[PDB]
Amino acid sequence: CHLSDMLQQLHSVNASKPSERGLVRQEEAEDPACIPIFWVSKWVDYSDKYGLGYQLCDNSVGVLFNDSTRLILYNDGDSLQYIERDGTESYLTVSSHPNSLMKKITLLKYFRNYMSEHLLKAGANITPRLPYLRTWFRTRSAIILHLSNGSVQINFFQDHTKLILCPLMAAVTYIDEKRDFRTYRLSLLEEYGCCKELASRLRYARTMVDKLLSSR
Amino acid sequence: PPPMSSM
The missing domain is CATH 3.30.1120.30 (POLO box domain)
Incomplete structure (x- = not known):
């Protein structure tokens, strides 16, 4: 179970307040070598x-x-x-x-x-x-999918945005409203910042990982 | 609630 690693990675990015500091250089956090092998389509x-x-x-x-x-x-x-x-x-x-x-x-x-x-x-x-689906749950806002390879996917209902979190790569893939598919290193989001939209979803993700950890 | 993903 890499959920503890995921929670720590999210604690770290969120604590860096990536959207609330200086110039956001989100593009510099992109890492195509970290693109996931699997996600829920x-x-x-x-x-x-x-x-x-x-x-x-x-x-x-x-x-x-x-x-x-x-x-x-x-x-x-x-x-x-x-x-x-x-x-x-x-x-x-x-x-x-x-x-x-x-x-x-x-x-x-x-x-x-x-x-x-x-x-x-x-x-x-x-x-x-x-990987298989270890577990899942739904909230009013999202469906949360936990894969056996440690990946956590969160699909938001209102705006169709999605996160694919991989604790092995310490990476997040964000699929936005225009269906742009971008993979970032979490440590690099700490280093270079990110937009308010992604920052808010990463805060939500932390709460969802806490839920997964508390219901194991 | 939506019983499936995006159509």
């Missing part, structure tokens, strides 16, 4: 009945089911990863699958088909540099 909240389905940017699809199990279909459309409630990981294929997983596979295929047909692909214009 689409999601469907069917948690009142089945669970939460998501598409990663590589076109792989996962579901976190209401029974606390996870099923992930690789982008080849056949290879499967199943994670039981106790945490046991199994690797198989749809072509071979146990009869006991037929229902969950079918559900996943419906999720997959819907996302492929109906939703915008977040970061669609970007070539990325397999």
Whole structure:
């Protein structure tokens, strides 16, 4: 769990008051070598009945089911990863699958088909540099998605802005209102500052990471 | 609340 590292990285950037000091030189904090490998491109909240389905940017699809199990279909459309409630990981294929997983596979295929047909692909214009969804929650303002590689993604509903936080790179990717996809080193935002918009979202992010840490 | 991401 790299959540503690993430919280520390956010504590540090926020404490530097990046938008409240001198000349903001945000462009100097950009680091394309830190562009994430994975993020959530689409999601469907069917948690009142089945669970939460998501598409990663590589076109792989996962579901976190209401029974606390996870099923992930690789982008080849056949290879499967199943994670039981106790945490046991199994690797198989749809072509071979146990009869006991037929229902969950079918559900996943419906999720997959819907996302492929109906939703915008977040970061669609970007070539990325397999994690599963550890957990998620929603607020009035955002959906928060925690990936098993330590990444935390926050999608804001009102303005469609998004953060992808990676504690391994100590980086943040910001997708703005114009769908501009920019990756920054957090330490460099400390060094060079950032706009009020990103600064406010990083403050929000800290609160969300606290929530993740307090509900582990 | 929106039950899915942006269309």
